[PDB]
Amino acid sequence: PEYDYIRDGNAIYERSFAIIRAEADLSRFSEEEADLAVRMVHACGSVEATRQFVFSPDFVSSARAALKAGAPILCDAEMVAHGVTRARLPAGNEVICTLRDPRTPALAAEIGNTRSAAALKLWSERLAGSVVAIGNAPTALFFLLEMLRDGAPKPAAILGMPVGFVGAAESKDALAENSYGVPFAIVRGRLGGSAMTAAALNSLARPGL
Amino acid sequence: PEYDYIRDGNAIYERSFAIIRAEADLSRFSEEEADLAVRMVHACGSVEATRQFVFSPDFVSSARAALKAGAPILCDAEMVAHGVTRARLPAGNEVICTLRDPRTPALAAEIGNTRSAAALKLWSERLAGSVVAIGNAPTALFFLLEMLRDGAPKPAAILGMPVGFVGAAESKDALAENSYGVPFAIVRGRLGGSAMTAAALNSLARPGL
Ligand SMILES: C/C1=C2/N[C@@](C)([C@@H]3N=C(/C(C)=C4N=C(/C=C5N=C1[C@@](C)(CC(=O)O)[C@@H]\5CCC(=O)O)C(C)(C)[C@H]\4CCC(=O)O)[C@](C)(CCC(=O)O)[C@H]3CC(=O)O)[C@@](C)(CC(=O)O)[C@@H]2CCC(=O)O
Ligand SMILES: C/C1=C2/N[C@@](C)([C@@H]3N=C(/C(C)=C4N=C(/C=C5N=C1[C@@](C)(CC(=O)O)[C@@H]\5CCC(=O)O)C(C)(C)[C@H]\4CCC(=O)O)[C@](C)(CCC(=O)O)[C@H]3CC(=O)O)[C@@](C)(CC(=O)O)[C@@H]2CCC(=O)O
């Protein structure tokens, strides 16, 4: 056979974002949130995810604000962390994920949680005005919420986009319910994911393409 | 507030796979393919993806066959590669991805393709009975198909699960149309993804949990 497919990524990129814009309904989204929406949709191939996207009044502004002023991303997974295209970061923003950190399994044990959650303890001195990215683990999100309630230092924003069938749904609305003084963004419901999260990060740290 | 969420991953894992089995329709799937289906669904939070899953008669058998006999996974992305839980691999199967390889951008240039595709050239001496994993890039899939047509050495199987709005759809059915003598597995349509792919890999390299 003779394959007549496109071999130019930017071309691909151009017609990809194009097809999407042409299909996803992005009306209620802020000219800036939209960007977020479309790559998110891009990364997942689902034009409907948009249905669940939810950004606190100033989420984009304040995170894009911070991700621009240097603020570190704190990924709950590594898929997410490896979805962030360094080449697109405003100011070499750190993509941190202590999931596979040597002391997380033990923090999980003594405190009684999950690696993804205990991991947040290693975040202890990096919450300060940062952009949290949890696109894989709701316990992490719930744990992050307790910290805050118990006198913790509010991050710059909170990407509550973990994906799941157990706990993700609640963790996320809980973020929305009482986010202890910080903006958020979540994909309410079961949907979420490293791709969408990273995609969202990618959108934030640099609009368009 | 007082959060009453579950902090035990295996518990989470137990009720996650449980909720799914309880919701996804897995009838036409092979008792073994099913496993694949459910984690895939797990990784994405979409019970419907199953609708698009498609495995060539012997895909599972021959890849699980190979992934068991040592056969290397050749990831087209790094998200996918970082979704493979080493802890679950049959025999330390290599998770290879030459996307971020120093010579790919140049292979893309001289031959006129995309990194993800030219990258496959670095696969040249690893196609031999291997399990290809393309959960991010259809040009890679199309390119892989040309190689085969032009006298290339058939991989052990082919995970045609790239996700996309341009080319992914065709690349995938093309895999199905003429896969040059090798089994496949694709998520027909736009859906696919590193998670689902990796999830699928994870399922293959070790059933259940
Ligand atoms: C960043 C990125 C890249 N994608 C590449 C691989 C690019 N993708 C592709 C595709 C078809 C695609 N991509 C995707 C997603 C993401 N892709 C992304 C993400 C994070 C974008 C977002 O949503 O924010 C998202 C996955 C979120 C995460 O996993 O967390 C889709 C799955 C949606 C897919 C679909 C396109 C379509 O068919 O419409 C390309 C065009 C080729 C494959 C093919 O044609 O089949 C490739 C570049 C090249 O090879 O020249 C990459 C190296 C591109 C670049 O040069 O800028 C860059 C990583 C740079 C680096 O290593 O730092
Ligand atoms: C492998 C894996 C892990 N997931 C962990 C992080 C585990 N997940 C979780 C979740 C809530 C989840 N997970 C997911 C997916 C995958 N998860 C996977 C994948 C690849 C499974 C598959 O589909 O094949 C898939 C993502 C495919 C890819 O990205 O390519 C979902 C997104 C579906 C999510 C949903 C669960 C639910 O709510 O129903 C756990 C339970 C905690 C977070 C929370 O409760 O909020 C965590 C372990 C722990 O902390 O004890 C991990 C370390 C688990 C382990 O110990 O075995 C292991 C990686 C080991 C390693 O580092 O090698």
Swiss-Prot record, chains A, B:
Disulfide bonds: none annotated. The keyword Isomerase applies. Substrate binds at S16, R39. It is an enzyme of class 5 (isomerase). The keyword Calcium does not apply. Keywords: Cobalamin biosynthesis, Isomerase. One of its GO terms (biological process) is cobalamin biosynthetic process. Pathway: Cofactor biosynthesis; adenosylcobalamin biosynthesis; cob(II)yrinate a,c-diamide from precorrin-2 (aerobic route): step 8/10. It holds the Pfam family CbiC. InterPro entries: Cbl_synth_CobH/CbiC (IPR003722), CobH/CbiC_sf (IPR036588). SUPFAM superfamilies: Precorrin-8X methylmutase CbiC/CobH. It comes from the Bacteria. Catalyzes the conversion of precorrin-8X to hydrogenobyrinate. Belongs to the CobH/CbiC family. This is Precorrin-8X methylmutase. It comes from Sinorhizobium sp.
